[PDB]
Write a protein that binds this ligand. Sequence first.
Ligand code: ZN
Lengths: 316, 76
Amino acid sequence: MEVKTIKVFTTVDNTNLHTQLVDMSMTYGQQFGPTYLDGADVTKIKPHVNHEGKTFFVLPSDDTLRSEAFEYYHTLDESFLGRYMSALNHTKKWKFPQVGGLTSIKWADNNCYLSSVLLALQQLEVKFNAPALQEAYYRARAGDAANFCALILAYSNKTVGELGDVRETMTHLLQHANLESAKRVLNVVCKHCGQKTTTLTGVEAVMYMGTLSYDNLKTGVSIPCVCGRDATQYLVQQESSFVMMSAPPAEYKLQQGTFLCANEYTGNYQCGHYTHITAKETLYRIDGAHLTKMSEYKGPVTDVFYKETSYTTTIK
Amino acid sequence: PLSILVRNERGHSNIYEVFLTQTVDTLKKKVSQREQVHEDQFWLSFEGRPMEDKELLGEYGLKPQCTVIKHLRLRG
Ligand SMILES: [Zn+2]
């Protein structure tokens, strides 16, 4: 009587692939040591029939690479390198077309959201503090993006094939970004409770949820208040290279010269599709490899980016 | 041993009892359960820092009556 088994490919360097039969009655960890798949740690799970034909990255339990990981990736997650390298096995099969002067990604593995993230970052005066992360970013700006995309999946804790959210991904990435002197002061006014000032730094200084308009936030936006009533919140002061304004996808107008770039989202919360809109001499809509130009635009938008240096309001 | 506030982005807030040594995954289950939203459909931040399912809540430095933010995830 034969043992239940599956054929999988194995690799310790993403170049060389060895065929392996895996025993179904033992975790991968028992058989190969620390093992990773599609950006997931599978060291402690048993083989599954659906894993047949997959490539797995094995990475011995060394903990010398733990020093490497810290210094080069700014992470103390022992699973990070494995997750990163198993992802890299996929992202190296992704194509990266140069479209309207930027690096984008050809549709595969639900990577539309990563395409938006990649497209957007290239237009921001932003930079990353983690050396390997920055170098990967650099290379992706020159057209060689497989590594950056794998790190993005890895820092965001996503697997290859997984639907995703640009704003959520940006929040993970920007933790590693050069935002140490980004600064935001907001004032909230409630008739009942009164007036309160809030000072933010880092990610929270450049990212906002509730409106797509940088004008609305300066002129005031309605927000619910502790007391239950609706109160007004507006931008007192902003020191940063850029801002990212987000909101649930709504029909929205983009006018050349009033923004940097933005993400269109069609569909619903359960399943949707991202494309990216940037402004050169005219509006470019980038849908992976496919490009459309247009002098104006209207559609479902959920993040809009703007260039910034210093702002001071003219309200009390 | 700790009560915190989880606040939606659509205004609402709800109190959760947690230990610093439960995971973010666990707390997402508490929120999934109370608020009737699948776990795959939202994420949690504390003071701008995304919370990772695998991590202990303690790693984020949560205090009594602090506010964790719940964010709806677009599945693009
Ligand atoms: Zn109030």
